[PDB]
Amino acid sequence: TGPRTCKDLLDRGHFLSGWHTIYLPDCRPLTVLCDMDTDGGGWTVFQRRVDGSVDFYRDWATYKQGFGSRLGEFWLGNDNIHALTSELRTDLVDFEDNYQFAKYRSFKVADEAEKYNLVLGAFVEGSAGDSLTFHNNQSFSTKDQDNDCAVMFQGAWWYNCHTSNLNGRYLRGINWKSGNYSYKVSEMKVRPA
Amino acid sequence: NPCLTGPRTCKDLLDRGHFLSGWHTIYLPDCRPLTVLCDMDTDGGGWTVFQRRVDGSVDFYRDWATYKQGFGSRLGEFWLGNDNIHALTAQGTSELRTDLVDFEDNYQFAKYRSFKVADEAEKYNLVLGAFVEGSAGDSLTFHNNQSFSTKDQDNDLNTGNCAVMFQGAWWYKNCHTSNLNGRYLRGTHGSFANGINWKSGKGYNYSYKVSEMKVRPA
Amino acid sequence: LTGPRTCKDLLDRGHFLSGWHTIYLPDCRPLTVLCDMDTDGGGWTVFQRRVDGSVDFYRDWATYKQGFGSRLGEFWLGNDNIHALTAQGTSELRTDLVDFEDNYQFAKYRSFKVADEAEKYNLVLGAFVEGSAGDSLTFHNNQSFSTKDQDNDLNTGNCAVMFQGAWWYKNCHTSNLNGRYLRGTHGSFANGINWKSGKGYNYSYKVSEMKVRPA
Numbered sequence A: 001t002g003p004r005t006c007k008d009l010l011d012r013g014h015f016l017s018g019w020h021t022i023y024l025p026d027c028r029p030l031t032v033l034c035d036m037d038t039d040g041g042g043w044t045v046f047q048r049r050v051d052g053s054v055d056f057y058r059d060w061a062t063y064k065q066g067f068g069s070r071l072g073e074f075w076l077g078n079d080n081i082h083a084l085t086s087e088l089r090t091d092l093v094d095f096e097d098n099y100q101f102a103k104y105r106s107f108k109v110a111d112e113a114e115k116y117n118l119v120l121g122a123f124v125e126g127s128a129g130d131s132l133t134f135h136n137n138q139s140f141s142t143k144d145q146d147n148d149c150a151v152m153f154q155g156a157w158w159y160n161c162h163t164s165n166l167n168g169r170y171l172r173g174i175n176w177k178s179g180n181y182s183y184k185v186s187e188m189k190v191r192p193a
Numbered sequence B: 001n002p003c004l005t006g007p008r009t010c011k012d013l014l015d016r017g018h019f020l021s022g023w024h025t026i027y028l029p030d031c032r033p034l035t036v037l038c039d040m041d042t043d044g045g046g047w048t049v050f051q052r053r054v055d056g057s058v059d060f061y062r063d064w065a066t067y068k069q070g071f072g073s074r075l076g077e078f079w080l081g082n083d084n085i086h087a088l089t090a091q092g093t094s095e096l097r098t099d100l101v102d103f104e105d106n107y108q109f110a111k112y113r114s115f116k117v118a119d120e121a122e123k124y125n126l127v128l129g130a131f132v133e134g135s136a137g138d139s140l141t142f143h144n145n146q147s148f149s150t151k152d153q154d155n156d157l158n159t160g161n162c163a164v165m166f167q168g169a170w171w172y173k174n175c176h177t178s179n180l181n182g183r184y185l186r187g188t189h190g191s192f193a194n195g196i197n198w199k200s201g202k203g204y205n206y207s208y209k210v211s212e213m214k215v216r217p218a
Numbered sequence C: 001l002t003g004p005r006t007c008k009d010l011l012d013r014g015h016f017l018s019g020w021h022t023i024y025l026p027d028c029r030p031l032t033v034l035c036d037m038d039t040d041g042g043g044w045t046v047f048q049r050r051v052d053g054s055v056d057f058y059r060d061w062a063t064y065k066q067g068f069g070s071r072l073g074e075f076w077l078g079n080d081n082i083h084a085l086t087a088q089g090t091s092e093l094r095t096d097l098v099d100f101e102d103n104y105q106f107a108k109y110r111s112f113k114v115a116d117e118a119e120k121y122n123l124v125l126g127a128f129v130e131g132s133a134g135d136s137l138t139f140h141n142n143q144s145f146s147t148k149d150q151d152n153d154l155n156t157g158n159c160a161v162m163f164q165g166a167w168w169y170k171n172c173h174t175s176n177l178n179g180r181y182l183r184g185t186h187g188s189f190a191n192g193i194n195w196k197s198g199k200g201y202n203y204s205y206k207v208s209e210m211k212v213r214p215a
């Protein structure tokens, strides 16, 4: 029928990163941020931090539906991420402009009934080093839902409790252990396996 | 056919499950499409943003015709246009919100119960309801029932030219206690009250990093 | 749709804010482009934008051909698109430049056309009309586009490599707007976002934009 993914869009000749609408297997439309530039492109970005203008210390309902701005920082929403999911790439930039990434061969979040349980594939490569497998098979947790954190390190993650905290505070935190240091830029993105 | 099925406000859009802030098209009461910036994130969301300053990349020291039609960029700073702002507030009760950020990352705000600008014939007269609350303090009530003025069309209550003296465009009285369309002066300035100023907020000598004005139906 | 064919059409239809809109190319191919509705009367289609150095412009032929970058920031629209945009009739060109002290310079030319890929996206430029940046494009008239992997210049070496850009290089250049984002004055010779008649071979601008409008 029409574009299912950012990869479809890239194959149809959309070469600039930006917000495009795609159709989920639901057939429900959704405008997403396509990264057409990184690692071959065709990535759908579901998380972005870039300047600390958006509060990421949010409750369950807010993470469920998504929040933020197409103009800047956002979380796409756990329902959308579930519908969406296919491999994972996390991109990270520090304040010295150093680039660091990690790539997982598969990435899926379950539905709300399974509390958006993270089921993550094998680490593939990445100067950032593996820091999410250790959170595999864990529900998602927000300040208004325990799960052995969210309040301790101020954020929301598949928390006993973490080795990455990308929805943490913009401290200039947004931590990746293998990578006390909060990154300038963080992006989480997906692409058909 | 799209007018009758399309959304009429950002609140409608939020109601249809649009949770990310961004530019969407809505249909004015006369059925004309208008691409607006929806703030879905702040104070429950569903706000239509008609003003935004963020980096000083756009000149806001503009004439009447330019303020009338709107100017700026969807990528950054803009004024939606006085005709559009009138169309959006002409019928019913839109509350107004003002969000301000300083260069030390202090977020401040002001909220009013209703906000309407009249049409061009009435020179976009401001009809402002009650100040509800806001950490930024009230700096708009002073401007109720004032015409809008630009450097080239002085409709203020000052014997001189407010828009020229304070280098902006606004519902100036004699002259102002707020000046959000003022120069992008970046924090403190020696020049007097000619920046993005909110008197009850950071005063007449400090120009905000971020300014946003937005409406939502009551 | 038979609708808007240019950013100027959009402006006439009452689109007053700069931003990305879709237009219909001469062949009815739809294209989403950045419209500058603010500058010099507005109605400009922007095909090049530098603003913060977040995008690598040191790219190969295929990449310049199809376009690259981001609607959120820096981009090159793509040589095929630029050709499609400028084949029929008269597009005038405006080049807008902003230094790190926020001073604006510009250059305006009466006509601007790039040929198709067979003709190596040749520069066909009209008379300089005015501009505070001076004229650093006319030197480049009637010259094939070159990238690091496709050397069509008049130098015995590879201009694109020597000045880390992609341009209508001769021997080698007087402007280099797709050069490295070097942030102001730089010791290194002429490998930044340079406009000789502007801030010279040793100053790289903060902002650069190249745009077209029906004359």
Ligand SMILES: *[C@@H]1O[C@H](CO)[C@@H](O[C@@H]2O[C@H](CO)[C@@H](O[C@@H]3O[C@H](CO)[C@@H](O)[C@H](O)[C@@H]3O)[C@H](O)[C@H]2NC(C)=O)[C@H](O)[C@H]1NC(C)=O
Pocket: B145
């Ligand atoms: C907005 O401001 C306009 C000025 O442009 C106000 O118009 C003025 O309204 C006052 C009411 O407070 C009128 O004063 C009254 O004058 C009559 C004589 O006509 C007198 O009997 C009363 O004792 C009282 O002083 C005044 O005429 C009028 N002036 C003009 C030039 O129209 C208007 O009231 C304001 N509107 C709102 C909603 O505040």
Ligand SMILES: *[C@@H]1O[C@H](CO)[C@@H](O)[C@H](O)[C@H]1NC(C)=O
Pocket: C142
């Ligand atoms: C352009 O240059 C080509 C060779 O590169 C030459 O054949 C032709 O005469 C030139 N045309 C014009 C109009 O300058």
Ligand SMILES: [Ca+2]
Pocket: B154, B155, B156, B157, B158, B159, B160, B161, B162
């Ligand atoms: Ca006056």
Ligand SMILES: [Ca+2]
Pocket: C149, C150
């Ligand atoms: Ca080659």
Ligand SMILES: [Ca+2]
Pocket: C151, C152, C153, C154, C155, C156, C157, C158, C159
């Ligand atoms: Ca050569």
